[PDB]
Design a protein around this nucleic acid. Structure first.
Lengths: 119, 91, 178, 75, 123, 16, 169, 74, 107, 71
RNA sequence: ACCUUAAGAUAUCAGAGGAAAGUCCUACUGAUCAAACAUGCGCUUCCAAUAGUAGAAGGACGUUAAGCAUUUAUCAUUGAACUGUUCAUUGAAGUCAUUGAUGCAAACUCCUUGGUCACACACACAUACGGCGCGGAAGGCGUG
RNA sequence: AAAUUUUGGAAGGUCUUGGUAGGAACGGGUGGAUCUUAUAAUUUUUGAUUUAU
């Protein structure tokens, strides 16, 4: 049982990947490498403002978000619309799946079922 | 992997490499191994806050290297070409 | 299985000194020298020029340039241009390899000469020189050759001039030197 | 001659020489005691372990110190 | 620039990438090899936002102008442990048809040279 | 033989 | 010209770092405990989702496991060919499915006398399951015929290969 | 000369206190089982973020990478 | 028994490998998460970045990365005296296994 | 797998910076494939207090291992 | 003189057949997927004055420039005056810079890049605008 | 259905667009990609860079 195999089954669905920095990537999800190296295409990066006056924010995250090169100069919040950002596997913290998909048909590990039948 | 073989080909020439602590090092590259361990000779170090010193040798663990800058001429290396001919290795 | 890409010899799988033995021999030490001579020779020889976008000249731009004159074009034969290109390439190589070392010959009898100019007893890069010429030892003292001018040294070499402009030189020197 | 670090830790275990283990920083503590046994991954069990901040710490008893935190093992 | 939806890191060879690191530094150079995903960049110039101008990116003239200190460094191999994410910025110098043409050219030349090498080394 | 952990086993096991 | 071509780039300029020092790098410390949540927020969560969604993908897993635990005891569940001892009687195996008892008796009589023949067929349908019991008038002759039919790439079955051996009863 | 693997085998159903490396958070409870990576499952464990006890915890699975040391309580 | 368990993972056979994986998931530290999925009781997972999630596990894995639904992210952001309690509800969530610290099963 | 090339640093004084701040100088005695190092007669350079007669350093926390000798 | 090797696999499910239970195979058959190659879409974006001396995109590791505004240049010991301040002495380290660094802004000069294509010098348009010349670049989608 | 249409195939016409020196079959102690397992245990991907108390 490897959940990377389940994650490979989405392949064309809208996800919301939240990296470890804090920045959350929203966009259509293409193939996922066996190391969880996601490749999203029509992405909209954003950075959550902590809503607290004195707690400012992550700074390295702002630097990375701006240096991606897609930040809107007139944008009030830190969003950067760009195409095809390739995300390294180890940086993902949690992936918010869409609400609409069915889990019962995708979570069935075909390889584990084959092994169980063979045994 | 290609980059490890390139760093191997870069032996004997002055390379500049920056560690993850912030420091920078440049000098003759004596030996490198498959795990990115390098041995610089006559290195000129820049500690993170800007001070610059000099040592005869250094052996930096590869797990700390951020990037390694080799001479530009190595772009024409034979192992960067994609379509290659092999001598049909013997039995 | 890893083979050298210069020697093209297929080498039985190694990772230790076996790769430090192959790369330190002679069939992989000068055969990697000939390779990068050729690749760098190409980037010197490249003559391809930028793509040419020719715009339709207008009447105001054409009339003035047509008024002035036609200009003759100098042209050489095939053998002559072959010889000229060979000469120019040789001249470029010779000038590029030239290094000026007048300051090294000028201080030949300095009191601390052996510690700086010898380049084998220096303190920065001497660690490399320190199986394979009457080298100058560091233990030299200024008592040796107390008077340099006792016929030991020779006159400074006259300055070089361009040969293609060798008729430019004044015909006669001012003073009569024997 | 050359002695590997595994052999050095084995000598510590055999001669019961007290060791002071440097846990790496942002933890700010040291462990002092005797090595009773070690592992592959520098996991060590310690008898009469003494907790010392970086000297008013409290004894801990017998502990198993995970090797991913150890930085030095000095006597 | 638009890039094909089914385009892994193998298709982006000689594309001019935008590689981002953990410490807020970006690298802008042509990708020429990979592996642990540690790239080789040709002319990548490293950019960073100084701590003195970081405060201008925080939410609030209308258009921000950030002076980014950049260093020039050539033919540098990165390490995959530090890489955070990669973006594409520009297409290669050569068009797709010309790329296929030069690939066919080099394949023909290599096959002929290999045949001649075998013919010489046997006899 | 995989990660150096196996090699270190084939040293520590003999050491004990 | 030895190293006149590998001229390195000028030394890299210095820029003041914008990250945290290697000594100050850490993840989040002072991670607060988990016990406080259990008292207050857990009650609200349980009150507002009484029951969880059914676990449906385990249904197929346990269903195929049921097949495994269902096949075995059912095959084990069980208890014309009750002739004399097989010392002089001969047996055949892997015969045709559409074969008959008279054809099997004739084939066995081709290389040995037959005293009693009764082919046992599957109870599901009246088709010869491939087993034929032939009583021979000579145990040595029956053994020799079985050896010949086993060494000669199997006896000639109509739509299979019929190897012969001892009855093993 | 006991090794850590036999030690953790011997600590099964023994009152142990494992402390994480983050905030001196210490969990005290009986050890139910262990994995080859020293993943620990504690039963009826009590949480000590500091010397003060916060409460009682039902059953906690503790990740392998966080434990600083596993010690046997009297 | 002891020999196969202590036996280095590069010399056991394939069948004994997945048998070992199943035994680890059934009789081991992850038996807690397996039970929590099977009887459908909520778990309170404390992440590395000071985030506590209350959810029901639907599939877990060797690296302890699980798929959760009915997630309810609870976390606090503070500076000095001031504190604010923020909560977020997520319908279906994938969670990577390198972040988790302690996984508490509801009584 | 592959033993690091430190066969020339044997019994020669070296100075290696533990983690990012500490710097320890001593006489190298041995090494392992993880780049664990055992160095005798250590001294924590900062006045500077000696560590002990025999210390081992986990190779995870080593960054650079420059040598203060002829090499 | 040192070196002679991790092992497996090469779309996937479902259906028919052959060598009780798997097991393998089928120039077998469906459905899905992926790759290549052809081939199309009133598909979408982009392709530089000469009726002129221009302009667009990206640079400069370019000048004005010591620009205009701020801000920085050690620690310990001892003696002396002093109401913390000043002068000298011993020891310890010490990236260069102060014409620097940092903040702001403008002019100028110059490099690379491009269909500098063809027909036109035109009164259009609410369903808002014949997207009804030939190519090229890049993607989206469909068929074989 | 022999009158009409749609679907499939053969032949011919017209217009266009691409190719033009290799291709098929068999084979192995043949190279390289991808995938699975050793492998979540210090040298890259199963967390010490949201600066924290």
């Amino acid at each position: 049982m490897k959940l990377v195999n389940f994650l490979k089954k989405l392949r064309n669905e809208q996800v919301t990947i939240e990296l470890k920095n804090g920045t959350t990537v929203w966009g259509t999800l293409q193939s996922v490498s066996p190391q969880m190296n996601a490749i999203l295409t029509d992405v909209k990066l954003t950075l959550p403002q902590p809503r607290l006056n004195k707690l400012n924010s992550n700074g390295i995250a702002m630097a990375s978000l701006y240096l991606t090169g897609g930040q809107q100069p007139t944008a009030s919040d830190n969003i950067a619309s760009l195409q095809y950002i390739n995300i390294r596997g180890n940086t993902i913290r949690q992936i918010i799946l869409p609400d609409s998909l069915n889990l019962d048909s995708l979570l069935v590990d075909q390889k584990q079922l084959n092994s169980l039948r063979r045994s | 992997g290609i980059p490890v073989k390139l760093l191997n080909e870069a032996q004997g020439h002055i390379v500049s490499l920056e560690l993850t602590t912030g420091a920078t090092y440049r000098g003759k590259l004596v030996e490198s191994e498959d795990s990115m361990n390098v041995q610089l000779r006559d290195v000129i170090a820049t500690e993170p806050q800007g001070a610059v010193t000099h040592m005869d040798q250094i052996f930096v663990r590869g797990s700390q290297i951020k990037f390694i800058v080799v001479p530009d001429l190595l772009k024409n290396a034979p192992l960067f070409k994609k379509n290659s001919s092999r001598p049909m290795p013997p039995i | 299985k890893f083979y050298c890409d210069y020697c093209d010899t297929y080498l039985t799988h190694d990772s230790p000194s076996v790769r430090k033995t192959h790369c330190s021999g002679r069939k992989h030490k000068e055969n990697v020298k000939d390779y990068y001579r050729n690749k760098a020779r190409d980037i010197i020889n490249k003559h391809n020029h930028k793509r040419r976008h020719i715009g339709k000249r207008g009447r105001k731009e054409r009339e003035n340039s047509s008024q002035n004159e036609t200009l003759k074009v100098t042209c050489l034969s095939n053998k002559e241009k072959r010889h000229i290109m060979h000469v120019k390439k040789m001249n470029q190589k010779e000038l590029a390899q030239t290094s000026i070392d007048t300051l090294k010959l000028l201080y030949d009898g300095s009191p601390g000469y052996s510690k700086v100019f010898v380049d084998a007893n220096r303190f920065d890069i001497g660690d490399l020189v320190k199986r394979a010429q009457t080298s100058r030892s560091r233990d030299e003292t200024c008592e040796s050759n107390p008077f340099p001018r006792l016929n030991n040294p020779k006159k400074l070499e006259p300055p070089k001039i361009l040969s293609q402009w060798s008729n430019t030189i004044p015909k006669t020197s001012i003073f009569y030197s024997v | 001659a050359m002695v590997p670090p595994i052999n050095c830790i084995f000598n510590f275990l055999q001669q019961q020489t007290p060791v002071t283990i440097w846990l790496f920083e942002q933890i700010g503590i040291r462990i002092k005691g005797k090595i009773v046994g070690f592992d592959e991954f520098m996991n060590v069990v310690i008898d009469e372990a003494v907790e010392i901040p970086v000297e008013k710490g409290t004894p801990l008893g017998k502990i198993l110190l995970k090797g991913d935190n150890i930085t030095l093992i000095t006597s | 620039i638009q890039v094909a939806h089914s385009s892994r890191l193998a298709n982006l060879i000689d594309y001019k990438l935008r590689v981002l690191t953990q410490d807020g530094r970006v690298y802008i150079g042509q990708l020429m090899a990979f592996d642990h995903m540690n790239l080789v960049l040709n002319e990548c110039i490293e950019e960073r936002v100084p701590k003195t101008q970081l405060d201008k990116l925080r939410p609030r003239g209308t258009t921000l102008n950030i002076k980014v200190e950049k260093r020039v460094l050539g033919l540098t191999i990165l390490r995959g442990e530090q890489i955070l994410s990669t973006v594409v910025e520009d297409k290669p110098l050569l068009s797709k048809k010309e790329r296929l043409v030069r690939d066919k050219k080099e394949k023909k030349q290599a096959q002929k040279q290999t045949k001649l090498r075998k013919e010489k080394e046997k006899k | 033989m995989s990660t150096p952990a196996a090699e270190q086993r084939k040293l520590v096991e003999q050491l004990m | 010209d030895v190293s006149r071509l590998f001229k390195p780039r000028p030394p890299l300029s210095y820029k003041r770092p914008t990250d945290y020092p290697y000594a100050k790098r850490q993840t989040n410390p002072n991670i607060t405990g988990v016990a406080n949540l259990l008292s207050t927020s857990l009650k609200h969560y349980m009150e507002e989702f009484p029951e969880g969604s059914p676990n449906n993908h385990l249904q197929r897993y346990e269903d195929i496991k049921l097949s495994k635990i269902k096949n075995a005891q059912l095959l084990d569940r069980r208890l014309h060919i009750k002739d004399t001892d097989p010392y002089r009687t001969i047996f055949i195996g892997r015969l045709p499915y559409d074969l008959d008892e008279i054809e099997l008796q004739k084939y066995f009589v081709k290389f040995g006398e037959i005293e009693k023949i009764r082919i046992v067929k599957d109870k599901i349908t009246q088709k010869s399951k491939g087993y034929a019991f032939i009583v021979f008038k000579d145990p040595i002759s029956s053994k020799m015929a079985f050896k010949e039919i086993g060494v000669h790439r199997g006896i000639q079955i109509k739509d299979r290969i019929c190897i012969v051996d001892i009855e093993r009863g | 000369p006991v090794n850590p693997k036999p030690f953790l085998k011997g600590l099964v159903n023994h009152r142990v206190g494992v402390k994480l490396k983050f905030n001196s958070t210490e969990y005290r409870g009986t050890l139910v089982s262990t994995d080859n990576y020293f993943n620990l499952q504690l039963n009826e464990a009590e949480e000590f973020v500091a010397g003060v006890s916060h409460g009682t915890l039902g059953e906690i699975f503790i990740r392998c990478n966080n434990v600083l040391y596993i010690r046997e309580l009297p | 028994s002891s020999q196969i368990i202590d036996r280095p993972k590069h010399e056991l056979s394939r069948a004994e490998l997945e048998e070992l994986e199943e035994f680890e998931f059934k009789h081991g530290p992850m038996s807690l998460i397996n039970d929590a999925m099977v009887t459908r009781t909520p778990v309170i997972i404390s992440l590395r970045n000071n985030h506590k999630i209350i959810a029901r596990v639907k599939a877990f894995d060797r690296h302890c990365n699980m798929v959760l639904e009915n997630v309810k992210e609870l976390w606090t952001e503070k500076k000095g005296k001031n504190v604010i309690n923020r909560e977020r509800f997520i319908s279906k969530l994938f969670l990577r296994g390198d972040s988790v610290i302690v996984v508490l099963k509801t009584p | 797998v592959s033993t690091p090339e430190l066969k020339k640093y044997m019994d020669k004084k070296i100075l290696l910076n533990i983690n990012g701040s500490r710097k320890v100088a001593g006489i190298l005695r041995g090494y392992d494939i993880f780049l664990n190092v055992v160095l005798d007669d250590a001294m924590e350079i900062n006045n500077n207090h000696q560590l002990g007669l025999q210390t081992v350093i986990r190779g995870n926390s080593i960054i650079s291992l420059e040598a203060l000798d002829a090499i």
